[model samples]
Target: GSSGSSGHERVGNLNQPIEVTALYSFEGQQPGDLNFQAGDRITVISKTDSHFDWWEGKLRGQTGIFPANYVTMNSGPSSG
Candidate 1:
């Protein structure tokens, strides 16, 4: 038997720059923190390893990090 691998295996893609809306107001307490208000739309750049930690994104022409759970993902091409 010949050693081989499956050819039909498809890898998943890391979809980034997603659109999200803030759930609450967050006045940046730190220098690298992102300041946004409730209902403010932000473009998600990336997320951290832990869900309880912070996430990176851009808002109001500013880029910085913020609480991961403070926003809701509401944009995607797969949505109907």
Candidate 2:
């Protein structure tokens, strides 16, 4: 299951806001288009750096991987 953390309390700085454009529940399923608010967050768990093997979030619960390109970062995380 996915949990939500405060923006400032994230593991690292989330310098950019991401829009959750689409949501897929599983393979060969219909994808849902999303209309997200400014603070909405999606948790994508990767088995490796290049793949989005799993996904979870407070709104969607657990789901399968989605195309990484769908998620865009407007800014890079702060240097730490």
Candidate 3:
């Protein structure tokens, strides 16, 4: 694929949002976590450290960990 227009393909997803929707309600039972409503939106900031079921994501202005399956993947995967 050749656009030959400019240099947009190099962007990779620098400004893409790790969008995801909460499928269930959470009470923030985690160790120093934030509460997330059932319909709140979350953004994945990084990959899971291990094979653990939970992934690191951001909700609101704070960072917290929610149930992995609690939200569905709704954003484009990073280009690595």
lDDT of 1: 0.82
Q: What does the lDDT read for residue 57 in candidate 1?
A: 89
Residue-level lDDT of model 2, residues 8-52, one tens digit each, is 453554454243433333232445323233434455442234435
**Model 1 spans with C-alpha error above 4 angstroms:** 1-16, 76-79
* TM-score for all models, in order of appearance: 0.69, 0.31, 0.59
Superposed model 3: Cα runs more than 4 Å off: 1-17, 49-52, 75-80
- Of candidates 3 and 1, the better by TM-score: 1
What number of backbone clashes does candidate 1 have, counting pairs of residues 3 or more apart or in separate chains?
0
Query: What tens digits encode model 1's per-residue C-alpha lDDT throughout 1-80?
Result: 78687554455455557788899989888888899999999888776556587888899899889987888878557856
> Taking the tens digit of each residue's C-alpha lDDT, what string does model 3 give over 1-80?
76766755642454555777888888778666657887888877754535347766788877877776777766466885
lDDT of each: 0.82, 0.39, 0.70
- The per-prediction tally of clashing pairs is 0, 0, 0
Over 4 Å off, model 2 = 1-40, 51-59, 74-80
Rank ordering of all candidates by lDDT, starting from the highest: 1, 3, 2
The weakest ten consecutive residues by lDDT in model 2 span: 21-30
